[PDB]
Design a protein around this ligand. Structure first.
Ligand SMILES: CCCCCCC/C=C\CCCCCC(=O)OC[C@@H](O)CO
Ligand SMILES: CCCCCCC/C=C\CCCCCC(=O)OC[C@@H](O)CO
Ligand SMILES: CCCCCCC/C=C\CCCCCC(=O)OC[C@@H](O)CO
Ligand SMILES: CCCCCCC/C=C\CCCCCC(=O)OC[C@@H](O)CO
Ligand SMILES: CCCCCCC/C=C\CCCCCC(=O)OC[C@@H](O)CO
Ligand SMILES: CCCCCCC/C=C\CCCCCC(=O)OC[C@@H](O)CO
Ligand SMILES: CCCCCCC/C=C\CCCCCC(=O)OC[C@@H](O)CO
Ligand SMILES: CCCCCCC/C=C\CCCCCC(=O)OC[C@@H](O)CO
Ligand SMILES: CCCCCCC/C=C\CCCCCC(=O)OC[C@@H](O)CO
Ligand SMILES: CCCCCCC/C=C\CCCCCC(=O)OC[C@@H](O)CO
Ligand SMILES: CCCCCCC/C=C\CCCCCC(=O)OC[C@@H](O)CO
Ligand SMILES: CCCCCCC/C=C\CCCCCC(=O)OC[C@@H](O)CO
Ligand SMILES: CCCCCCC/C=C\CCCCCC(=O)OC[C@@H](O)CO
Ligand SMILES: CCCCCCC/C=C\CCCCCC(=O)OC[C@@H](O)CO
Ligand SMILES: CCCCCCC/C=C\CCCCCC(=O)OC[C@@H](O)CO
Ligand SMILES: CCCCCCC/C=C\CCCCCC(=O)OC[C@@H](O)CO
Length: 448
């Protein structure tokens, strides 16, 4: 129908490709924690709920950390369009694995398939959106807003459809629905891409030169050997527990930025030095925002009297508030504060969302059930902070893609401190710590 919301026709294919990837990812994301609880509940999965909560966080962390390499692989080894397709195949296979009649045994294979596949697909689907606007186009900003709208839309309907299906039929039937969404995205992506997309991106745009293959091989091989060497030393010293492997990835996930930062601090260097508070602010915000899939999901199931609807539906509040807030903040910023002071306020709101959640337990006690409106207000606050941090954050800096992996890595340690006895302290303490750190950044907003 000629333009798609004024944008080139190929936005529709990419819009829907990622809408269905996000449907498959976030639909699984809404019921995976309850799935592990269920597997624990029947004795099939021998971990604590604290460990089940830490897996959700470190699972997310690796997915974002898989996304920093995906652009490289498609820009230099395979194509951008092949990375999205074959990434989608891996995400679909990851969900098929959980739909099969397995239990805990399938969990690792599903997690590893989706980590790799999302890493190939997620950065390069955004790359293909840029290829629609050849160069120096005003439409670019609008078309990415359309693309992101399909992202949030798929994240919004997925807990509704997949969560209700888990309620209706099994967990396995619900996971197959996630697999089917990715399949739908592949159909539209494949047949729709052939018609629209540039055949230039069937092939790497910056292919490896003859002399670059061997150093890259050495580099990737040295990384795997040392990583494999660490793992065998762990088991030798007796650190072979699942919580210990999560700590390895935690250390790995946080050391990558630290090493890049210490690297660049080794010519008006203080521009870099300026980014440390900005980066730390992004990590703590993403930590709180990514705990909604974990800590807030636990609260909804254990602590909210939600007996007339599936508890996983609370995951739809995150993209819903993004979609309601997003046209406003577009209007708001065309009619303005700095990038650092935007970060601090974002962490303040994020901290306000956790402070709000400390109130019901303090007032009513912890052995009962509270209104679902508490969680509704909590997500309203944290997504408010996302509007300030996210659209601005990429500009102030990818190394910013990594802030999400570190926040979830930190989460893999913190969420194990959450339970009913620790509820009010967890929310209040970490919620206050975020707001206070936002005050320090407002003080530090002077220097940049
Ligand atoms: C958590 C890691 C999962 C990785 C799954 C997707 C990537 C698969 C293989 C990675 C090898 C490619 C070489 C890595 C690399 O050199 O990246 C550097 C590049 O991103 C610099 O911007
Ligand atoms: C599996 C069955 C057939 C293999 C299809 C390979 C498609 C790889 C690919 O790059 O697709 C990109 C898509 O945009 C097609 O134009
Ligand atoms: C140097 C490469 C970094 C490592 C990236 C690949 C990490 C692969 C998997 C880790 C994802 C989180 C693991 C969660 C997990 O172990 O769950 C499976 C467990 O429940 C099976 O009983
Ligand atoms: C790509 C499309 C994926 C195709 C997967 C579709 C269906 C797979 C069947 C999964 C549901 C069957 C199942 O195991 O449920 C268990 C059931 O017996 C519990 O009542
Ligand atoms: C599962 C295969 C991926 C679905 C798809 O769209 O591929 C169709 C394409 O291979 C037709 O030639
Ligand atoms: C799945 C296999 C293990 C993962 C492969 C990791 C890739 C890292 C190093 C090998 C580079 C492979 C690409 C080689 C290549 O195509 O270079 C040839 C060059 O002349 C044209 O690009
Ligand atoms: C890939 C390397 C890190 C994977 C960590 C997950 C894992 O292997 O879990 C092992 C644990 O289930 C056995 O006790
Ligand atoms: C370089 C990597 C540095 C440290 C890797 C060790 C990971 C932490 C292992 C650990 O202490 O887990 C505790 C576990 O033993 C509890 O049973
Ligand atoms: C927005 C401004 C303030 C909201 C603070 C949270 C609401 C506190 C509150 O209403 O608690 C009492 C509640 O139980 C109503 O019965
Ligand atoms: C803009 C609206 C956001 C309003 C949220 C602000 C919430 C501020 C403070 C709530 C902290 C509650 C601290 C809980 C507490 O007092 O602990 C004692 C409690 O255990 C007594 O049973
Ligand atoms: C910004 C909007 C208003 C927010 C006000 C902050 C709410 C602070 C506290 C909520 C009521 C908690 C009362 C806790 C308390 O008094 O403990 C008493 C009792 O538990 C002694 O053990
Ligand atoms: C940013 C806006 C924050 C507003 C969120 C605060 C709204 C909280 C409650 C409003 C409805 C009152 C229900 C109180 C409640 O939780 O029920 C407790 C009751 O079951 C104890 O017997
Ligand atoms: C649009 C998709 C998001 C779905 C979110 C799930 C619904 C969230 C809030 C609706 C609750 C309205 C009040 C429900 C209610 O009856 O109150 C329970 C009672 O315990 C109040 O204390
Ligand atoms: C948002 C406004 C704060 C909500 C609130 O104070 O609760 C009032 C509620 O108890 C009415 O019954
Ligand atoms: C300035 C940057 C702030 C970085 C994080 C801020 C809060 C960090 C730590 C809070 C203390 C909690 C320590 C307890 C903990 O981490 O538990 C992990 C342990 O259970 C591993 O499973
Ligand atoms: C603790 C009881 C309530 C006190 C809260 C009142 C508001 C808190 C702090 C007020 C701002 C402190 C000074 C902030 C400031 O000087 O900013 C300057 C900075 O923007 C220069 O670039």
């Amino acid at each position: 129908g000629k333009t798609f919301f004024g944008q080139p026709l190929g936005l529709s294919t990419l819009f829907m490709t990622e809408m269905w990837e996000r449907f498959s990812y976030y639909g699984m994301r809404a019921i995976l924690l309850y799935y592990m609880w269920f597997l624990i509940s029947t004795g099939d999965l021998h971990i604590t709920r604290a460990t089940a909560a830490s897996i959700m966080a470190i699972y997310a962390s690796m997915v974002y950390l898989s996304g920093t390499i995906g652009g490289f692989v498609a820009d230099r080894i395979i194509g951008a369009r092949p990375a999205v397709f074959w990434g989608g195949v891996l995400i679909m296979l990851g969900h098929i694995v959980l739909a099969l009649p397995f239990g805990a045994s399938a969990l690792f294979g599903s997690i590893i398939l989706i980590i790799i596949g999302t890493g190939f697909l997620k950065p390069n689907v955004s790359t293909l959106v840029g290829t629609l606007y050849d160069e120096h186009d005003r439409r670019r900003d609008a078309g990415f807003s359309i693309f992101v709208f399909g992202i949030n839309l798929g994240a919004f309907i997925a807990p509704l459809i997949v969560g209700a299906a888990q309620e209706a039929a099994g967990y396995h039937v619900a996971f197959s629905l996630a697999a089917i969404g990715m399949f739908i995205g592949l159909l539209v992506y494949y047949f729709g891409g052939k018609k629209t997309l540039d055949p230039h991106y069937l092939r790497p745009t910056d292919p490896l030169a003859p002399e670059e293959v061997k150093p890259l091989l050495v580099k990737v091989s040295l990384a795997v050997a040392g990583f494999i060497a660490i793992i065998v030393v762990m088991n030798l010293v007796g650190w072979n527990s699942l919580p210990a492997y999560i700590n390895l990835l935690t250390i790995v996930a946080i050391a990558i930025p630290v090493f890049y930062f210490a690297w660049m601090i080794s010519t008006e260097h203080l521009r870099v030095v300026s980014y440390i508070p900005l980066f730390i602010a992004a990590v703590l915000f993403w930590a709180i925002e990514e705990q909604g899939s974990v800590v807030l999901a636990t609260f909804a199931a254990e602590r909210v009297d939600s007996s007339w609807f599936p508890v996983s539906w609370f995951q739809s509040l995150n993209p819903l508030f993004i979609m309601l807030y997003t046209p406003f903040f577009a209007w708001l910023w065309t009619a303005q504060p700095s990038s650092p002071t935007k970060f601090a306020v974002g962490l303040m709101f994020a901290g306000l969302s956790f402070l709000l959640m400390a109130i019901p337990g303090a007032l009513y006690g912890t052995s009962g059930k509270v209104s679902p409106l508490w969680l509704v207000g909590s997500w309203a606050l944290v997504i408010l902070g996302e509007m300030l941090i996210s659209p601005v954050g990429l500009s102030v800096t990818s190394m910013w893609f990594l802030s999400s992996s570190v926040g979830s890595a930190l989460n893999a340690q913190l969420v194990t401190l959450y339970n009913a006895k620790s509820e009010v302290a967890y929310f209040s303490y970490f919620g206050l710590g975020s707001v206070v750190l936002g005050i320090v950044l407002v003080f530090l907003s002077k220097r940049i």
